[PDB]
């Protein structure tokens, strides 16, 4: 006879993401040699680590200006990749195509002011479960860093990944009133003669930043 | 961790500064070849459809992640639902060729028909953005014709990307972007 077989039900239907290859129609073509062209990237995270991008603030400017008043809160926002501030970054660009992430998100600060102006800043991480701090003295109990202006114009701060579950959703669920990942807060301790001087901020992936489960959300 | 921001050299600070410990990462799901290999829908045209990766919507997962690289290379797999006989033609061949059964032709077999197609363009690597709005006619994998085509899908194979470009998310009106998440 001939080798018998059983055609099984529920198998063989086409799957858009399935892991198998089409039957080749038309063979024996050779490509023009492309070897060692410049600027190649094999992974979309590496370009996210090596190329930080700007944030978004009120007035639609990627910087925050020093302020003189009783209010030392310079900028304050949710830690999420769906935030409005992050929205313009490349890092929050990839997020919309993945459900979950873990790892560190780095923030870069660069003081733009003139050489005769000096300021001192505080960045801090407010974990979830309590209202975020409205004053640097209140924030001083959180995880924080502090730096001032000088020869080096740039500071880099790693925002830890700290959560109960090993991964966290990228998207922000509509039934979530308060951010699950907490907030990060940026304060101005004081400023010498810094009125009207700008601090540009940047964001990029950290060493351990990991992103998984691709999904097409529209957007 | 302070440094000179104007340098543009990448500086990644870690949690060990204030006494944390960096954890282990598994990045498989962000791999370019992995993430771009899957089918994405393209609104077809009744008879002749030129195979082009830029026809994919920009907001789809495959469309967006494609457009973030200036220079891309990959093979192609198509999945087509059509009436009649689906005829494929290589890059740069005349339109009058699509009427010849000698060219690769897949006779109708329900529900649909899946093919695997080589990279047929003359250029060493294709491009998502071209400086010269229009993109040159030489960027395409060829065309397919059938009596009518109901659905069309693209699946990239062996994808390779170069020179990344901006990738944008949806800009919230409120402080966050709140969506309804699947819940029991």
């Amino acid at each position, epitope marked *: 006879g001939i080798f018998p077989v059983a055609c099984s039900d529920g198998y063989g239907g086409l799957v858009t993401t399935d892991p198998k290859t089409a039957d080749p129609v038309y063979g024996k073509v050779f490509n023009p040699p492309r070897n060692m062209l410049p600027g190649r990237f094999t992974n979309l995270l590496d370009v996210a680590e090596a190329c930080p991008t700007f944030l978004h603030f009120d007035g639609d400017v990627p910087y925050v200006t020093t302020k003189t008043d009783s209010d030392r809160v310079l900028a304050q926002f*949710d830690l999420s990749l769906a*935030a409005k501030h992050m929205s313009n970054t490349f890092l929050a660009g990839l997020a919309q195509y993945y459900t979950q992430y873990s790892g560190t998100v780095n923030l870069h600060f660069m003081f733009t002011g003139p050489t005769d102006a000096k300021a001192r800043y505080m960045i801090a991480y407010a974990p979830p479960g309590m209202e975020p701090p409205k004053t640097p003295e209140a924030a001083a109990h959180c995880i924080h860093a502090e730096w001032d202006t000088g020869l080096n114009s740039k500071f880099t701060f790693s925002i830890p990944y700290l959560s109960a579950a090993d991964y966290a959703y990228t998207a922000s669920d509509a039934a979530e009133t308060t951010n699950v990942q907490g907030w990060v807060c940026l304060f101005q301790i004081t400023h010498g003669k810094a009125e009207g001087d700008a601090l540009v901020v940047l964001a990029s992936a950290g060493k351990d930043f990991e992103l998984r489960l691709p999904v097409d959300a529209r957007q | 961790t302070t440094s000179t921001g104007e340098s543009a050299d990448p500086v990644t600070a870690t949690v060990e500064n204030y006494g944390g410990e960096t954890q282990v990462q598994r990045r498989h799901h962000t791999d370019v070849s992995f993430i771009l290999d899957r089918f994405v829908k393209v609104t077809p045209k009744d008879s002749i459809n030129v195979l082009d990766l830029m026809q994919t919507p920009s907001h789809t997962l495959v469309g967006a992640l494609l457009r973030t690289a200036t220079y891309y290379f990959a093979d192609l797999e198509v999945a087509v639902k059509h009436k009649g006989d689906l005829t494929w033609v290589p890059n740069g061949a005349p339109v009058a060729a699509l009427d010849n059964t000698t060219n690769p032709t897949a006779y109708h077999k329900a529900p649909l028909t899946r093919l695997a197609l080589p990279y047929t363009a003359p250029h060493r690597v294709l491009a998502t953005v071209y400086n010269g709005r229009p993109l040159p006619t030489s960027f395409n994998y060829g065309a397919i014709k059938a009596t009518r085509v109901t659905e069309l899908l693209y699946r990239m194979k062996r994808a390779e990307t170069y020179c990344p470009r901006p990738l944008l998310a949806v800009h919230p009106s409120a402080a966050r972007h709140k969506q309804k998440i699947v819940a029991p």
Partner: nanobody
Amino acid sequence: VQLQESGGGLVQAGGSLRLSCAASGRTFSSYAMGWFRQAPGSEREFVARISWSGGSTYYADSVKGRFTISRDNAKNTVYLQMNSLKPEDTAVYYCTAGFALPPSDYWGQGTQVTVSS
């Protein structure tokens, strides 16, 4: 934590209204406060903001100079004083609390305002 708008109504062009929003359930002096407006058939747009200290504000361009936001931490409430009203301003005005530069989360139900001409 729940918000309640009030002070809405009807008016004719050039008029003025004072909207009132009361907060409940937690400290009001720790929150930034802001207003959103949804004009019918358009998506909802931003209006104005006030920091917890009452010091800093921000106004949407179209409403810039016509409207004035103010909060009372003693009275646990926030106010939007609408002036030089214009038939475009017809919308439902949502009171919003929150932390972020835009106040966002913790919305009230919003009040109806129709200026006529």
